[PDB]
């Protein structure tokens, strides 16, 4: 596909995907285990920007 | 465009797009008349995954 | 790759991929277990139209 | 990236991006300063169409 | 195709595509009924810059 | 769609659809009323070279 | 490349290259020996529409 | 072009082009002198799967 | 954007923008201070071949 | 361009781009200030694997 | 991902992974068990031509 | 292909191919006869940044 999950987010380098920095959630990916790529933030920002017009 | 509606969803083969399997909604596309392609589910999943962070 | 399998066809929602509706091939995907995306139909259609040339 | 902000929306020609047609918001981009391209409306429509299934 | 018309220009929001603001051509789209996307401007700009070569 | 029908074949210039040439079949497009593009010819030559017939 | 010459024009099916139909330029191609693809036509029509001329 | 012959098949590493391993056709390429790329294999497998034959 | 400005033209090596060569105009880029890429040259040669001038 | 920098790597979330975790290079991005996307790893990996050939 | 690993290299036909040929190393793929594609060969030849070593 | 040599480097405008400016290698191209495109520069800079060397 043109845009796959891997094009939108990548495994967080801090928790290596666990979402954890024990005993707390991982601060770098705020618990998700992944961080957004520029393409993912572009798409997310766009949707949030216009979803409720 | 890079991603058109047709790249994101296709007409449901069960109801041929009607969203109906009379007398009930069509079960395969749960009433929408279309089903998601891998590219559409990837995009939808991504948005739902991060929209409320 | 530019056009991967998932860009061409998607799991049939009627048989969820088995290609079967016992005792018959699944009629929605013609026993293939997948339905074509618009890009897949476009390609199949073109090859078929010009196969003898 | 495959789809950048500029592929999804363009500066509104009426307010040149200000979101204003003084003393009121700009009517053409309904206050946002940008209007959607076909690719942006396709993506937005798709998300709104399936986000709550 | 890789770059379709809709990738290049989008219906002008001021005249909704007529190209008119009677009695004049619509000033926002220069009577064209469409405004350029960034990709359209990029292309037009390049051709114009090197047209005599 | 990256590869559309019109990117694989372009309407025949010697006819324009009727795919004919009164009273026999059109020579240029063998009656199909469309000719192949470099992309279309490329795909077809490949499939035919390997479908191993 | 994204858009190659091959993406923009095809070998004319009437003169096949020369663009000649003796003793005159090939009518179908205007002597050029090539006809436009849908991509070629889209880009050219775009430029023609806004080039100013 | 989106998909060029080069995208679909490579020079066979056993006969390097000829597809021959004297006195017989090259086993690895079936004499064709080329082996398939993952893109080639995806498209061919697609067509084979639905061509009906 | 699939095709950006910098994919159509790359800064001239003999000058670097001033598009000059004291006291006359820069030879390599004819004063435009940018030279064409294969993509840029491709597009321009096509437009010029068909704009029919 | 088809693959831009942002398609290859994204600001490291641990050092926010400085490449530093004083007094050391940031261990998460190896002092680079960026982490690779899947496309970036794929490319780096391929070049490295075949660098001596 | 536009360019995946399998688009840069395709499994060697003379071995299939072991990257060997008992008792020495595989000749065709020099022990790497994968050969280069036009895309992969293209990228590698470019990097090597400019990395200036 | 996605990225062709033509996408990565252009004919040098100082020596036009040879990369020579007698009796020395062409300064602009380092004798290579080609200069980098923005795409070439992006990919090379990427590899250089992480190759380790
Ligand atoms: Zn984390
Ligand atoms: Zn249905
Ligand atoms: Zn089925
Ligand atoms: Zn506005
Ligand atoms: Zn207007
Ligand atoms: Zn005809
Ligand atoms: Zn002709
Ligand atoms: Zn062979
Ligand atoms: Zn210059
Ligand atoms: Zn870091
Ligand atoms: Zn081998
Ligand atoms: Zn030079």
XYZ file of C-alpha atoms and ligand atoms in Angstrom:
648
model
C 0.000 0.000 0.000
C 0.937 3.637 -0.512
C 0.951 4.261 3.290
C 1.454 1.339 5.672
C 1.408 1.409 9.489
C 5.279 1.549 9.306
C 5.122 4.750 7.317
C 2.957 6.369 9.954
C 4.637 5.390 13.206
C 7.789 3.659 14.403
C 8.653 1.709 17.465
C 9.652 4.016 20.274
C 13.448 3.869 20.854
C 13.050 4.498 24.600
C 10.860 1.538 25.519
C 11.491 -0.429 22.353
C 7.720 -0.668 21.988
C 6.678 -1.645 25.511
C 5.086 1.717 26.322
C 6.773 1.410 29.700
C 9.677 2.967 31.532
C 9.069 1.104 34.814
C 7.428 1.912 37.140
C 5.791 4.542 34.922
C 4.517 4.671 31.372
C 7.200 5.517 28.874
C 7.432 9.334 28.547
C 8.741 9.421 24.945
C 5.823 7.610 23.272
C 3.435 8.472 26.097
C 2.527 4.809 26.651
C 1.802 3.765 23.049
C 5.071 2.048 22.226
C 5.401 3.945 18.961
C 6.153 7.484 17.902
C 4.706 9.246 14.822
C 6.692 9.744 11.658
C 6.314 13.128 9.889
C 3.782 11.449 7.540
C 1.740 10.168 10.450
C 1.669 13.498 12.273
C 0.705 15.264 8.974
C -2.263 12.929 8.551
C -3.287 13.029 12.215
C -3.015 16.850 12.375
C -5.065 17.192 9.188
C -7.856 14.999 10.483
C -8.019 16.697 13.864
C -7.905 20.058 12.132
C -11.018 19.399 10.050
C -12.968 16.609 11.638
C -15.496 18.803 13.388
C -16.068 21.541 10.821
C -4.694 11.413 -6.229
C -2.336 9.149 -4.311
C -5.272 7.612 -2.343
C -8.783 7.748 -3.797
C -12.019 6.509 -2.193
C -11.577 3.298 -4.322
C -8.239 2.620 -2.702
C -9.785 2.816 0.738
C -12.980 0.809 0.390
C -14.720 -1.405 -2.147
C -18.295 -2.232 -2.821
C -19.462 -5.027 -0.577
C -19.824 -8.294 -2.568
C -22.731 -9.473 -0.389
C -25.159 -6.611 -0.954
C -23.422 -5.205 -4.004
C -23.441 -1.853 -2.222
C -27.017 -1.695 -0.941
C -26.074 -2.172 2.716
C -29.030 -4.532 2.904
C -29.640 -8.244 3.150
C -33.440 -7.963 3.448
C -35.109 -7.731 5.880
C -31.950 -6.848 7.819
C -28.913 -4.692 7.202
C -26.192 -6.485 5.323
C -23.939 -8.308 7.839
C -20.738 -8.257 5.731
C -20.395 -4.470 5.372
C -22.505 -3.806 8.460
C -24.909 -1.567 6.523
C -22.400 0.685 4.727
C -22.396 -0.973 1.326
C -18.608 -1.045 1.216
C -15.843 -2.934 2.948
C -12.381 -1.532 3.804
C -9.306 -2.372 1.793
C -6.075 -3.022 3.758
C -5.065 0.607 3.008
C -8.328 1.932 4.379
C -8.183 -0.120 7.570
C -4.504 0.951 8.072
C -5.505 4.611 7.858
C -8.647 4.218 9.968
C -6.808 2.201 12.660
C -4.017 4.783 12.776
C -6.405 7.671 13.255
C -8.439 5.930 15.935
C -5.223 4.870 17.622
C -3.951 8.428 18.045
C -6.851 10.796 17.738
C -7.363 11.320 21.443
C -3.790 11.385 22.727
C 6.685 -2.413 -3.914
C 4.370 -0.029 -5.695
C 1.423 -2.428 -6.034
C 1.344 -5.186 -3.483
C -1.123 -8.013 -3.140
C -3.223 -6.109 -0.609
C -3.482 -3.281 -3.171
C -5.064 -5.784 -5.570
C -7.503 -7.827 -3.529
C -8.835 -8.040 0.005
C -10.060 -10.919 2.141
C -13.582 -11.798 1.138
C -15.969 -10.771 3.834
C -18.378 -13.667 3.095
C -16.038 -16.555 3.675
C -13.405 -14.601 5.580
C -10.740 -15.971 3.230
C -11.476 -19.700 3.018
C -12.875 -19.368 -0.506
C -15.657 -21.784 0.634
C -19.378 -21.796 1.365
C -19.664 -25.553 1.768
C -20.278 -27.500 -0.261
C -19.497 -24.845 -2.893
C -16.770 -22.415 -3.706
C -17.821 -19.151 -2.023
C -19.914 -17.346 -4.640
C -18.859 -13.878 -3.518
C -15.165 -14.443 -4.241
C -15.550 -17.267 -6.767
C -13.698 -19.589 -4.359
C -10.656 -17.317 -4.302
C -11.107 -16.070 -0.708
C -10.446 -12.531 -1.929
C -12.417 -9.827 -3.720
C -10.726 -7.389 -6.082
C -9.951 -3.769 -5.254
C -10.602 -1.261 -8.021
C -6.855 -1.420 -8.874
C -7.023 -5.249 -9.063
C -10.114 -5.172 -11.363
C -8.508 -2.517 -13.493
C -5.420 -4.706 -13.971
C -7.208 -8.015 -14.443
C -9.608 -6.380 -16.864
C -6.776 -4.890 -18.996
C -4.782 -8.133 -19.210
C -7.901 -10.108 -20.088
C -8.904 -7.636 -22.767
C -5.578 -7.858 -24.521
C -4.455 -11.388 -23.505
C -4.478 -12.630 -27.115
C -2.139 -9.860 -28.219
C 6.243 12.137 2.199
C 3.568 10.589 0.005
C 0.932 13.078 1.311
C 2.052 16.400 2.786
C -0.136 19.121 4.330
C 0.064 20.911 0.896
C -1.488 17.927 -0.810
C -4.419 17.995 1.570
C -5.327 21.670 1.752
C -4.387 24.947 0.096
C -4.431 28.505 1.218
C -7.852 30.012 0.734
C -7.844 32.449 -2.238
C -10.476 34.683 -0.604
C -8.657 35.576 2.606
C -5.228 34.492 1.440
C -5.034 32.400 4.602
C -6.247 34.872 7.223
C -9.571 33.115 7.814
C -11.107 36.577 7.820
C -13.258 38.692 5.558
C -13.578 41.615 8.000
C -15.634 42.098 10.072
C -16.667 38.446 9.729
C -14.865 35.151 9.358
C -14.025 34.326 5.785
C -16.992 32.469 4.209
C -14.984 30.481 1.618
C -12.712 28.590 4.039
C -15.133 29.028 6.933
C -12.457 30.632 9.128
C -9.625 28.114 8.648
C -7.563 29.976 6.079
C -7.297 26.907 3.872
C -9.597 24.911 1.649
C -9.419 21.125 1.082
C -7.958 19.616 -2.048
C -9.796 16.595 -3.536
C -7.235 14.350 -1.760
C -7.909 16.002 1.572
C -11.688 15.776 1.275
C -11.365 12.077 0.204
C -9.358 11.309 3.339
C -11.541 13.403 5.649
C -14.780 11.919 4.234
C -13.399 8.393 4.602
C -12.460 8.901 8.226
C -15.760 10.503 9.165
C -17.572 7.772 7.277
C -16.037 4.959 9.326
C -14.719 6.384 12.541
C -17.651 5.360 14.691
C -18.521 1.952 13.259
C -2.210 8.251 -13.275
C 0.412 9.664 -10.963
C -0.691 13.308 -11.201
C -4.296 13.797 -12.143
C -6.178 17.016 -12.687
C -7.484 17.063 -9.119
C -3.852 16.826 -7.942
C -3.170 20.059 -9.841
C -6.101 22.343 -9.151
C -9.310 22.390 -7.149
C -12.685 24.019 -7.707
C -12.472 27.665 -6.784
C -14.386 28.294 -3.628
C -15.372 31.850 -4.688
C -17.223 31.037 -7.860
C -17.706 27.345 -7.144
C -16.249 26.528 -10.567
C -18.022 28.904 -12.954
C -14.911 31.062 -13.342
C -17.281 34.094 -13.093
C -18.119 36.944 -10.736
C -20.408 38.760 -13.148
C -19.704 40.818 -15.034
C -16.043 39.820 -14.591
C -13.949 36.720 -14.668
C -13.773 35.555 -11.035
C -10.721 37.322 -9.602
C -9.844 34.502 -7.219
C -9.311 31.936 -9.978
C -8.618 34.364 -12.828
C -11.770 33.101 -14.586
C -10.484 29.528 -14.607
C -12.948 28.162 -12.010
C -10.049 26.401 -10.293
C -7.235 27.387 -7.944
C -3.868 25.647 -8.057
C -2.676 23.087 -5.525
C 0.946 23.387 -4.444
C 1.802 20.633 -6.990
C -0.011 22.578 -9.757
C 1.827 25.854 -8.898
C 5.103 24.010 -8.715
C 4.558 22.604 -12.219
C 3.166 25.746 -13.818
C 5.946 27.780 -12.260
C 8.693 25.451 -13.607
C 7.322 25.346 -17.164
C 6.888 29.115 -17.213
C 10.395 29.695 -15.928
C 11.967 27.613 -18.646
C 9.347 27.959 -21.433
C 11.800 29.721 -23.768
C 14.297 26.883 -23.498
C -5.550 4.515 -8.223
C -1.888 4.566 -9.297
C -2.568 2.656 -12.438
C -5.889 3.380 -14.041
C -7.338 2.024 -17.239
C -6.491 5.144 -19.168
C -2.817 4.728 -18.172
C -2.782 1.269 -19.668
C -4.619 2.068 -22.867
C -5.443 5.189 -24.780
C -8.386 5.539 -27.187
C -7.466 4.637 -30.763
C -6.817 7.679 -33.011
C -7.868 5.951 -36.252
C -11.417 5.250 -34.955
C -12.395 6.531 -31.502
C -14.345 3.631 -29.939
C -16.461 1.962 -32.624
C -13.379 -0.232 -32.944
C -14.326 -0.582 -36.606
C -13.540 0.778 -40.076
C -16.612 -0.014 -42.222
C -17.358 -2.561 -43.289
C -14.606 -4.635 -41.640
C -12.769 -4.364 -38.293
C -10.508 -1.441 -37.364
C -6.864 -2.186 -38.350
C -4.976 -0.042 -35.811
C -6.725 -1.395 -32.687
C -7.904 -4.766 -34.078
C -11.506 -3.858 -33.192
C -10.873 -3.195 -29.477
C -11.021 0.554 -30.120
C -8.175 1.270 -27.700
C -4.414 1.009 -28.112
C -1.744 0.161 -25.543
C 0.485 2.633 -23.693
C 4.091 2.062 -22.713
C 2.774 1.110 -19.259
C 0.041 -1.090 -20.692
C 2.328 -2.652 -23.302
C 4.945 -3.179 -20.576
C 2.552 -5.028 -18.288
C 1.065 -7.165 -21.036
C 4.500 -8.161 -22.505
C 5.571 -9.200 -18.967
C 2.451 -11.235 -18.135
C 2.647 -12.995 -21.535
C 6.310 -13.724 -21.139
C 5.734 -15.474 -17.828
C 2.201 -16.711 -17.633
C 4.166 -19.350 -19.552
C 0.920 -19.343 -21.498
C 11.379 8.857 -12.742
C 7.864 9.694 -11.596
C 6.829 10.845 -15.102
C 8.874 9.517 -17.994
C 8.436 10.459 -21.648
C 6.825 7.019 -21.976
C 4.234 8.093 -19.467
C 3.368 11.121 -21.590
C 3.111 9.959 -25.182
C 2.971 6.724 -27.113
C 4.120 5.612 -30.551
C 1.412 6.644 -32.986
C -0.515 3.602 -34.295
C -1.021 5.161 -37.782
C 2.533 6.004 -38.891
C 4.248 4.114 -36.077
C 6.963 6.660 -35.198
C 7.518 8.708 -38.326
C 4.283 10.671 -37.970
C 4.098 10.527 -41.745
C 1.330 9.282 -44.039
C 2.997 10.053 -47.388
C 3.306 12.539 -48.820
C 1.959 14.404 -45.756
C 2.629 14.632 -42.011
C 0.689 11.889 -40.215
C -2.760 13.342 -39.504
C -3.224 11.343 -36.249
C -0.002 12.583 -34.716
C 0.554 15.851 -36.566
C 3.809 14.335 -37.833
C 5.166 14.017 -34.298
C 4.942 10.238 -34.450
C 3.441 10.096 -30.981
C 0.012 10.454 -29.463
C -0.715 11.600 -25.943
C -1.497 9.361 -23.011
C -4.178 10.375 -20.521
C -1.313 11.524 -18.254
C 0.177 13.579 -21.106
C -3.218 15.116 -21.916
C -3.837 15.975 -18.219
C -0.498 17.754 -17.818
C -0.633 19.579 -21.188
C -4.251 20.640 -20.671
C -3.175 21.929 -17.248
C -0.343 23.996 -18.582
C -2.434 25.288 -21.535
C -5.168 26.272 -19.043
C -2.942 28.540 -16.975
C 0.199 29.273 -18.966
C -1.427 32.502 -20.271
C -1.275 32.190 -24.028
C 6.636 4.674 -15.536
C 5.110 3.322 -12.340
C 6.053 -0.283 -13.231
C 8.878 -0.733 -15.707
C 10.111 -4.044 -17.101
C 13.054 -3.544 -14.730
C 10.623 -3.538 -11.858
C 9.250 -6.905 -12.953
C 12.201 -9.121 -13.791
C 15.949 -9.125 -13.389
C 18.851 -10.530 -15.385
C 19.203 -14.161 -14.377
C 22.346 -14.717 -12.258
C 22.971 -18.224 -13.728
C 23.087 -17.590 -17.491
C 23.179 -13.802 -17.217
C 20.729 -12.928 -20.021
C 20.808 -15.851 -22.417
C 18.804 -18.146 -20.144
C 21.017 -20.922 -21.448
C 23.175 -23.445 -19.589
C 24.495 -25.376 -22.608
C 23.251 -27.391 -24.257
C 19.923 -26.703 -22.486
C 17.684 -23.738 -21.637
C 18.849 -22.179 -18.361
C 17.058 -24.094 -15.597
C 16.874 -21.053 -13.245
C 15.170 -18.849 -15.796
C 13.525 -21.397 -18.078
C 15.667 -19.958 -20.879
C 14.035 -16.546 -20.522
C 17.237 -15.050 -19.159
C 15.339 -13.233 -16.439
C 14.006 -14.051 -13.012
C 11.054 -12.385 -11.355
C 11.231 -9.635 -8.781
C 8.855 -9.661 -5.819
C 6.798 -7.065 -7.741
C 6.768 -9.310 -10.829
C 5.760 -12.342 -8.747
C 2.952 -10.361 -7.018
C 1.440 -9.166 -10.298
C 1.799 -12.518 -12.125
C 0.432 -14.482 -9.166
C -2.485 -12.026 -9.139
C -3.296 -12.484 -12.773
C -2.836 -16.294 -12.585
C -5.192 -16.333 -9.568
C -8.100 -14.718 -11.386
C -7.424 -14.887 -15.113
C -9.461 -18.142 -15.296
C -7.100 -20.655 -16.828
C 4.362 16.638 -3.140
C 5.510 13.931 -5.573
C 7.182 16.389 -7.840
C 8.743 19.334 -6.104
C 10.706 22.195 -7.562
C 14.007 20.702 -6.536
C 13.143 17.523 -8.488
C 12.651 19.557 -11.622
C 15.699 21.759 -11.297
C 18.894 21.645 -9.333
C 20.973 24.709 -8.400
C 23.623 25.525 -11.001
C 27.146 24.335 -10.049
C 28.976 27.050 -12.016
C 27.310 29.886 -10.029
C 24.956 28.987 -7.171
C 22.021 31.413 -7.567
C 23.347 34.802 -8.676
C 22.665 33.351 -12.119
C 25.569 35.490 -13.311
C 29.282 35.352 -14.148
C 30.544 38.958 -13.870
C 30.110 41.084 -15.734
C 27.785 39.210 -18.117
C 25.158 36.473 -17.605
C 25.988 32.966 -16.367
C 26.652 30.608 -19.335
C 25.681 27.240 -17.812
C 22.216 28.285 -16.571
C 21.611 31.251 -18.923
C 21.119 33.532 -15.899
C 18.313 31.493 -14.284
C 20.780 30.119 -11.731
C 19.232 26.646 -11.829
C 19.659 23.783 -14.280
C 17.171 21.119 -15.358
C 16.978 17.543 -14.062
C 16.045 14.497 -16.095
C 12.526 14.894 -14.672
C 12.473 18.627 -15.322
C 14.032 18.296 -18.778
C 11.572 15.479 -19.529
C 8.530 17.555 -18.625
C 9.706 20.658 -20.450
C 10.642 18.744 -23.677
C 7.137 17.175 -23.614
C 5.208 20.415 -23.023
C 7.227 22.164 -25.772
C 6.716 19.332 -28.186
C 2.950 19.526 -27.814
C 1.953 22.952 -26.666
C 2.351 23.152 -30.450
C 3.842 26.474 -29.413
C 10.791 13.820 -4.306
C 9.681 10.250 -3.814
C 11.694 9.583 -0.643
C 12.553 12.654 1.345
C 14.567 12.925 4.518
C 11.463 12.821 6.708
C 10.535 9.537 4.982
C 13.858 8.119 6.193
C 14.277 9.282 9.765
C 12.410 11.266 12.389
C 13.537 13.502 15.232
C 14.630 11.365 18.134
C 12.145 11.633 20.922
C 14.823 11.177 23.634
C 17.020 14.115 22.805
C 14.485 15.963 20.675
C 17.078 16.245 17.899
C 20.244 17.410 19.661
C 21.856 13.977 19.341
C 23.068 14.479 22.968
C 22.466 13.106 26.451
C 25.337 14.962 28.083
C 28.047 14.058 28.433
C 27.358 11.335 25.844
C 25.949 11.037 22.391
C 22.249 10.236 22.899
C 22.097 6.436 23.056
C 18.657 6.216 21.469
C 19.732 7.843 18.201
C 23.458 7.094 18.441
C 24.141 10.853 18.576
C 22.396 11.422 15.252
C 19.335 13.237 16.670
C 17.120 11.078 14.461
C 15.770 7.531 14.549
C 15.160 5.571 11.361
C 11.743 4.923 9.848
C 11.171 1.434 8.479
C 11.985 2.809 4.980
C 15.254 4.328 6.299
C 16.301 1.034 8.000
C 15.378 -0.900 4.906
C 17.628 1.334 2.785
C 20.533 1.579 5.207
C 20.396 -2.158 5.761
C 20.506 -2.934 1.996
C 23.422 -0.589 1.261
C 25.375 -1.930 4.225
C 24.766 -5.519 3.206
C 26.111 -4.986 -0.273
C 28.531 -2.064 0.325
C 31.571 -4.137 -0.695
C 30.021 -5.001 -4.044
C 6.778 1.251 2.187
C 7.537 2.326 -1.396
C 10.832 0.562 -1.447
C 10.943 -2.639 0.520
C 13.768 -5.092 0.923
C 12.306 -7.481 -1.592
C 12.298 -4.681 -4.204
C 15.999 -4.177 -3.704
C 17.019 -7.810 -3.671
C 15.455 -11.045 -4.749
C 16.344 -14.468 -3.306
C 19.136 -16.185 -5.231
C 17.905 -18.873 -7.679
C 21.084 -20.983 -7.511
C 20.746 -21.543 -3.724
C 17.707 -20.115 -1.922
C 19.129 -18.659 1.319
C 21.892 -20.939 2.602
C 24.058 -18.591 0.550
C 26.337 -21.581 0.010
C 27.188 -24.321 -2.495
C 28.870 -27.099 -0.464
C 31.534 -27.099 0.578
C 32.485 -23.542 -0.442
C 30.497 -20.287 -0.764
C 27.682 -19.782 -3.283
C 29.050 -18.289 -6.555
C 25.963 -16.449 -7.855
C 25.246 -14.459 -4.667
C 28.749 -14.541 -3.113
C 27.303 -16.158 0.030
C 24.718 -13.433 0.758
C 21.963 -15.684 -0.596
C 20.178 -12.788 -2.298
C 20.832 -11.039 -5.600
C 20.250 -7.413 -6.582
C 17.294 -6.048 -8.557
C 17.420 -3.224 -11.066
C 16.210 -0.955 -8.246
C 18.681 -2.398 -5.761
C 21.556 -2.412 -8.254
C 20.617 1.154 -9.232
C 20.741 2.433 -5.665
C 23.961 0.642 -4.793
C 25.795 1.791 -7.998
C 24.742 5.388 -7.161
C 25.793 5.318 -3.492
C 29.156 3.746 -4.445
C 29.741 6.247 -7.186
C 29.314 9.157 -4.797
C 30.035 8.048 -1.290
C 33.400 8.862 -2.879
C 34.300 5.777 -0.880
C 11.396 2.114 -11.227
C 10.650 4.271 -8.200
C 14.185 5.748 -8.188
C 16.094 5.602 -11.451
C 19.682 6.729 -11.984
C 18.109 9.737 -13.719
C 16.368 10.575 -10.490
C 19.693 10.607 -8.654
C 22.158 12.521 -10.793
C 22.144 14.739 -13.841
C 24.581 15.416 -16.666
C 27.046 17.983 -15.379
C 26.500 21.391 -17.042
C 30.258 22.240 -17.021
C 31.837 19.273 -18.832
C 28.552 17.795 -20.038
C 29.256 14.100 -19.347
C 33.017 13.728 -19.419
C 33.541 15.398 -16.045
C 36.689 16.849 -17.556
C 37.862 20.457 -17.837
C 41.218 19.818 -19.545
C 43.737 18.897 -18.482
C 41.996 18.164 -15.148
C 38.943 16.283 -13.858
C 35.890 18.554 -14.054
C 35.837 20.517 -10.789
C 31.996 20.749 -10.683
C 31.498 17.015 -10.964
C 34.790 15.670 -9.636
C 35.277 14.078 -13.061
C 32.162 11.946 -12.634
C 30.340 13.901 -15.319
C 27.213 14.077 -13.198
C 25.908 16.259 -10.418
C 23.441 15.191 -7.771
C 19.738 15.902 -7.790
C 17.977 16.848 -4.562
C 16.784 13.212 -4.417
C 20.364 11.972 -4.893
C 21.659 14.350 -2.207
C 18.899 13.264 0.242
C 19.654 9.558 -0.165
C 23.469 9.939 -0.110
C 23.371 12.284 2.886
C 21.161 9.688 4.593
C 23.521 6.837 3.984
C 26.598 8.944 4.908
C 24.818 9.948 8.145
C 24.333 6.397 9.381
C 26.588 4.110 7.366
C 29.274 4.413 10.101
C 32.339 5.655 8.285
Zn 8.162 4.601 24.482
Zn -22.847 -5.432 2.363
Zn -15.567 -15.598 -0.340
Zn -10.765 32.041 3.502
Zn -13.267 31.521 -9.033
Zn -9.045 1.801 -34.084
Zn 1.265 9.086 -36.556
Zn 19.163 -17.945 -16.476
Zn 24.924 29.208 -13.512
Zn 18.492 11.000 20.483
Zn 23.249 -18.121 -4.281
Zn 31.349 18.158 -14.950
